[PDB]
Each structure stands twice: as C-alpha cells, then as structure tokens.
Amino acid sequence: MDLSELERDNTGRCRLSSPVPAVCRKEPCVLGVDEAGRGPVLGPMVYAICYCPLPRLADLEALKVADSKTLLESERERLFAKMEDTDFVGWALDVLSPNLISTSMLGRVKYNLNSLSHDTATGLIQYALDQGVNVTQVFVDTVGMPETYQARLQQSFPGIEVTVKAKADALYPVVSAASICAKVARDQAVKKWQFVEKLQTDYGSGYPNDPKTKAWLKEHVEPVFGFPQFVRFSWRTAQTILEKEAEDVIWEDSSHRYFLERGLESATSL
Amino acid sequence: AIERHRVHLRSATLRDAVPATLHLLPCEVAVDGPAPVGRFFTPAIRQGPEGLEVSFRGRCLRGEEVAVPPGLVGYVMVTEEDRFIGATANFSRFTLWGLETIPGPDAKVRGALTWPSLAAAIHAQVP
Amino acid sequence: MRQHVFLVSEYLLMFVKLVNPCSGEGAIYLFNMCLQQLFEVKVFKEKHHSWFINQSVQSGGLLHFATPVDPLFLLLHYLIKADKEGKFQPLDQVVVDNVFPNCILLLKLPGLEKLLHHVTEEKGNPKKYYKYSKEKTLKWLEKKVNQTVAALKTNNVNEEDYIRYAHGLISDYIPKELSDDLSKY
C-alpha cells in the first residue's frame, strides 16, 4: 500500500506499479499521464500513469482526488491511499534518478530532456498495454507544445484516442489522480534517498533560483569530482558553478608504424 | 660529475609496496594531487550488462579490469618538484575506463601492453 | 610530486640518459647495477587520459615500460662513429661521449668480447682493439630480422609482408644510413 521500493539505491530507473484490477482487463480504460521533478537541479524526476475503466469514470470524481497546488504532502498521501482501496483504480510510476538525467543529456549523442520525458511517458502507456490493461483513451498534461506530443503518441499508439493538453490536470480527473501519484512518489523518493557517496541535509525545493539550493550547491563543490550524484550535471546551474569552482576536464567530444599504431615512443624525461 | 645524468631508485622500497587501485580514465584532468576517490568514485561503481558502470562529471563510464601480463610487475614511482626516486606502491591490475562503452580491441593502451613480450624477443641474443 | 606508472620485468639500479642509437638524441634507460643489465624506457602517450592512483589523480595517463635492449645497438653507434675517423682503437677511445657521459657503463658489460664478435673486426694479443666491420654487421642484422619475424608470427601482429615490417622495426635502433644498406642486402 505504501511506496517502500523507494528505500533501495537508484543510479538509473525505478519502476513501481499497483496490481492490475480485474475490471481493467475487460472494460475499455481511460489513462492519465503527469510528471514531478522536471525543473530541480537536485533529485529525481517522476512520471506517473493512473488508469480506470470507462463506466467508473464518474466514480473517480466521487472521491476528491482532484489536483491542487495548495495540497499538503500528507493531504496527497491520503488521496493516494483512497485510490489504493478502490477496486478499479490502477497506477504505474517511473522514478528517473538525477544520474540517469545527467548521463542521458551529457552522453556522446545528446538525448534531450524532452525526448527522455516523452519516452518515459510512452513506456508507461506501453507497460499498461503489456500488463493486460484495455487502454482505449489516453490523456496527457504537457508543459509546452501539445500538437507535436499528440502526433508523436498517435504514431506510437495508432489505435488509441490520444489527448494532449496544457493544464490537463485541472481539466481531466484521470490526469489529476496521476499528478497525486507523481508528487507523492517524488516527495517519498527525495525523503528516503539512499545515497551512493561516502559523505554526509537542508537544500530547499531543489529549484535553481532557490537561495537554499544555490547555497547547498556552492557548499558541496569538490574540485575533481564536482558534485555528488544527487545533482543534475546537465543543468546550466550546475555547469556554471563547475566552470568557476571545479578543475577543468577534457573529453574526446570537447618512428615506425608499430610504435605509432599503439601510441608508444622513447622516454626523454623521468 | 657523471651523477647529473643519473636518478637513483630505492631498492628497499620495491619490496615494501601494498597493492594500489589504478583506474585509467578516458578524460584529461588538469590537476595533480589528492582526491576522495573512496568517497565519490569507488562507492558508485556498479555491475552492468557490458561491464563495470560508473559516472564521472555526469558522464557514463563503462570499463573492465585489465590484468598486468605475466613477466611484468607494476610499480608506482614518485619524484620531487644527488637525484632520487622511490617505488611507493605495487599493482597486479588496473581498471580501464571508456566513455559509454568499454574501449575496443584496437585501443592503443591494449596495443602498448603487448610490447614487452615482442621487445623480449627482438632484443634476445642471436645464436 | 608527479607519480609515474611503470611496467618493469618480473624479476625486478638507476635511470640513465644515454644516446638513442637511431635518432642520435637523448633517451632514458634503466641500468641494473648488480647484474650489469640494460633496459630501455618506452612511454605510452595518448590524448584524453588520466590516472587515479588510490586517493590521487595523475593528469598524464602515461604508462611507462622498462624492457631489455640488445646492447650491440648502442655499441654500434660508437663503433660506426669511430669507423670513419681512422682505424683500430681500444674500447675506451671508441665509447666516448661528452654529451652523454654515462656511456662508461657499456665498457663494464658482462661478455663484451663475445658480443663485439658479431659486428667488429678485432686485433690484439691476450688488449683489445676494435674496428667496425660492415659485412659482419649486416650478417648480424639479417639474424635480427629473422629473430623478429619468428616473434611477429607467435604474437600475431600484422613472408615478404612481415619481412618489410621487421626491417622497419629494427630501423628504430640503427641509423638511417645503415637501414638503407640493410634493405639492399
């Protein structure tokens, strides 16, 4: 019933799902997609999907599972549990570690944040399909352009009704519920974050403009390593601090044939 | 007089040498000094599909532990800023690191390792 | 304090700057005193590399190799130099270098007479006076090329194909003038 799986070490991806209801396999389902942790320099990014059958859509409105910016962490946890005791509500989470965000964006081939965000979304929609969920309608909340995202998802799912809209959380109840899952999972992920580094608290929201975050960032600068894995190296906030406070690093991106082929030469010094 | 061209090494320090963990990075780090490798690097090393997985500066590094070939011994020598040099540590193997993937079989480091074997035959006394 | 990563022969004295037999310039060698053995220092340098030695970083990414050398190559450098000058001299007058004063070490090598037999015409009543012989040298180099060709196949590097490769490898120990005579031979 609780997100206990978030207690173990994360260096890549961490998938969490509710058991698929019996109803969800037969009746046609409606799916909602939302995210938490897109903007912070610190911590993971969580993507969530929430599904329920078409007849029990009004029954989803019956419980006050609507999204709100005012909602407390405890207030969201009560609505999440209220979904868990519901015989028809299903859900699936994807907790992308700051290291996975860093490594993807800072790779040899640039895997952009928006592609990685959209690919995680399709992956959960596909996961549901593979799990016997009869998804016939998909509702997605977007931060930017809905036209391209909707066209993308239609090519990925040509037999499913795809609706991508800005502020879809305030408009559709499935998207509101998915939003509660993402926020709860994000809060719980940053709360009990198992940390890979052998050194050890208050950082704030994790956002770049946050004074506590930039204070924590400046404090945790190491000249050789730069920052611990909890920081998103790809973010311009981390990069600028690194450029001024840490030591320079050079990557490939930024005499007879035998000896020349294997970078060998005679030593003139030491 | 002729000592100017020769730098002497402590023979007793070659015996007193505990194995040292050697990592060969695919990036150039301008600094030369101490580092908390055991704080950032070592506890982050993971086991993946290809080989060992770790990330340095937010970039994924994938590598394998390369063994020092039989007939060779690894020593780490230190010199100051009569001339002297001393073997501080020993090593039986070094971990090789490549960006995203383990360096190929055509990697120059792997080619250089096959030299002392050929050099032992090139320079052998003719009968 | 810069750290150096070395790959020396299993059984293993000081570091000596001697003449490079082919280049005629400086080259670092590792001389063993107790056994009177000579080694050459080769360096692995490739761009974008660094070392992590325990709790430290080494900017280089350099890998040093101390491998044995055939002393005859260096001995030839002095024998060829003296050859043009005149005729038949003792070893103390041939192995002379004001630039590289550590060439004295070559005179104290074990089994010099047996070694010099390969590349020099000698006179002396049991002295010893040596004169550089071209016929013996090319015959000795012919053996060196065959010695390496046998080693190339075993190690599987990359009959005429490997012969022209072995000549080029050995030419990194003998001056350009000698290399040309070896190919014609």
Q: For residue B55, give the CATH number of its domain.
A: 2.40.128.680
Q: In what order do the strands lie in the sheet with B59-63?
A: B46-47, B52-56, B59-63, B98-99
Which chain B residues touch C54 with a CB distance below 8 Å?
A: 20-21, 37, 89
Rounded alpha-carbon distances, angstroms, from residue B107 to A74, B48, C10: 55, 21, 25
* The three-state (H, E, C) secondary structure of A54-94, written as one string: CHHHHHHHHCCCCCCCCCCHHHHHHHHHHHHCCCCCEEEEE
| Helices first, then strands: H and E counts in chain A | 11, 8
Contact assessment for residue A159 and residue A166, using Cβ atoms and an 8 Å cutoff: no
Structure token pair of residue A140: 């997605």
Q: Which one-letter amino acid corresponds to residue A96?
A: L
| Helices first, then strands: H and E counts in chain B | 4, 12
Q: Which residues of A touch B (CB under 8 A)?
A: 11, 99, 102-103, 105-108, 196-199, 222-226, 228-229, 232-234, 238, 242, 247-253, 261-264, 270
Q: What kind of architecture, by CATH, is found in domain A200-247?
A: Orthogonal Bundle (1.10)
For C19, phi and psi rounded to 5 degrees?
Answer: -75, 140
Query: In a 10 Å sphere around its CB, with 0-12 CB exposed, 13-18 middle and 19+ buried, how is residue A249 labelled?
Result: buried
Residue whose token pair is 């107790």: C34
Of B11, B27, B72, the CB nearest to C13: B11
Total domains in the fold of chain B: 1
Structure token pair of residue A59: 């029954």
B91 has which bridge partners? Answer: B74
Q: Do C171 and A259 touch (CB under 8 A)?
A: no
**Strand residue runs (E) in A183-236:** none
Structure token pair of residue C156: 């599987």
Rounded alpha-carbon distances, angstroms, from residue C126 to C4, C79, C120, C123, C129: 47, 21, 17, 10, 11
- Is the C-alpha dihedral spanning A62, A68, A71, A76 positive or negative? positive
Contact assessment for residue A212 and residue A236, using Cβ atoms and an 8 Å cutoff: no
C154-160's contacts with Cβ under 8 Å and 24+ in sequence apart are: C154/B121, C155/B114, C155/B117, C155/B118, C157/A258, C157/B118
Rounded alpha-carbon distances, angstroms, from residue A203 to A192, A217, A230, A231: 14, 8, 11, 11
> What is the Cα–Cα distance from B22 to B20, expressed in whole angstroms?
6
Rounded alpha-carbon distances, angstroms, from residue A238 to B57, C119, C137: 10, 66, 65
How many CB atoms lie under 10 A from the CB of residue A9? 12
Going by C-alpha positions, the residue among B87, B76, B68 that lies closest to residue B14 is B87
Angle at Cα A54 formed by Cα A48 and Cα A60, nearest 5°? 60
Beta-carbon contacts of residue A268 (< 8 Å; ≥ 6 apart): C25, C26, C27, C28
Q: Which one-letter amino acid corresponds to residue A211?
A: P
User: What is the per-residue burial (b if ≥16 Cβ within 10 Å, else e) of C40-57?
Assistant: bbbbbebebbbbbbbbbb
Going by C-alpha positions, the residue among B119, A2, A254 that lies closest to residue C42 is B119
Beta-carbon contacts of residue C115 (< 8 Å; ≥ 6 apart): C71, C72, C75, C109
3 state SS of A15: strand
For A96, phi and psi rounded to 5 degrees?
Answer: -85, 115
Q: What kind of architecture, by CATH, is found in domain A3-199?
A: 2-Layer Sandwich (3.30)
Contact assessment for residue A162 and residue A54, using Cβ atoms and an 8 Å cutoff: no
The C-alpha of C107 sits at a distance from chain B's nearest C-alpha, in angstroms, of 15
> What is the Cα–Cα distance from A104 to A144, expressed in whole angstroms?
21
Q: Which helix (H) or strand (E) holds A269?
A: none
Say which DSSP state C102 is in.
Answer: G
Total domains in the fold of chain C: 1
The upper half-sphere exposure of residue C127, i.e. CA atoms within 13 Å in the direction of its Cβ, equals 11
Contact assessment for residue A29 and residue A22, using Cβ atoms and an 8 Å cutoff: no
> What is the Cα–Cα distance from A19 to A90, expressed in whole angstroms?
7
3 state SS of A155: helix
Rounded alpha-carbon distances, angstroms, from residue C59 to A264, B45, B86, B109, C46: 18, 21, 20, 16, 12
Any chain A CB within 8 A of the CB of B99? yes
- As annotated, the residues of chain A forming the CATH 3.30.420.10 domain(s) are 3-199
Angle at Cα B82 formed by Cα C109 and Cα C92, nearest 5°? 30
Beta-carbon contacts of residue C139 (< 8 Å; ≥ 6 apart): none
The C-alpha of B106 sits at a distance from chain C's nearest C-alpha, in angstroms, of 12
Residue whose token pair is 């403009």: A209
Subunits next to B (3 or more Cβ pairs <8 Å) are A, C
Task: Tell me which residue range forms the domain holding C164.
Answer: 1-185
Structure token pair of residue C177: 């003038």
Task: Tell me which residue range forms the domain holding B57.
Answer: 1-127
- As annotated, the residues of chain A forming the CATH 1.10.10.460 domain(s) are 200-247
Structure token pair of residue A50: 């929430």
3 state SS of A44: coil
Residue whose token pair is 């053995």: C37
Q: Are strands A90-96 and A15-17 parallel, antiparallel or unpaired?
A: antiparallel
Rounded alpha-carbon distances, angstroms, from residue A231 to A42, A43, A45, A227: 5, 6, 12, 6
Which chain C residues touch B63 with a CB distance below 8 Å?
A: none
> What is the Cα–Cα distance from C166 to C181, expressed in whole angstroms?
15
Going by C-alpha positions, the residue among C69, C30, C46, C62 that lies closest to residue C172 is C69
3 state SS of A174: helix
Residue whose token pair is 């029954």: A59
| Longest distance between any two alpha carbons in chain B, whole Å | 59
Going by C-alpha positions, the residue among C47, B59, B50 that lies closest to residue A109 is B59
Rounded alpha-carbon distances, angstroms, from residue B13 to B16, B50, B75, B86, B88: 5, 38, 10, 6, 7
Angle at Cα A112 formed by Cα A40 and Cα A124, nearest 5°? 80
Rounded alpha-carbon distances, angstroms, from residue A46 to A80, A132, A206: 15, 23, 14
How many Å separate Cα C114 from the centre of its chain? 17
Cα pseudo-dihedral C101, C103, C108, C109, rounded to 10: 150
How many CB atoms lie under 10 A from the CB of residue A202? 7
Asked whether residue A34 is marked as a ligand-binding residue, the answer is yes
User: What is the per-residue burial (b if ≥16 Cβ within 10 Å, else e) of A26-50?
Assistant: ebebbbbbbbbbeebbbbbbbbbbb
> What is the Cα–Cα distance from B71 to B117, expressed in whole angstroms?
8
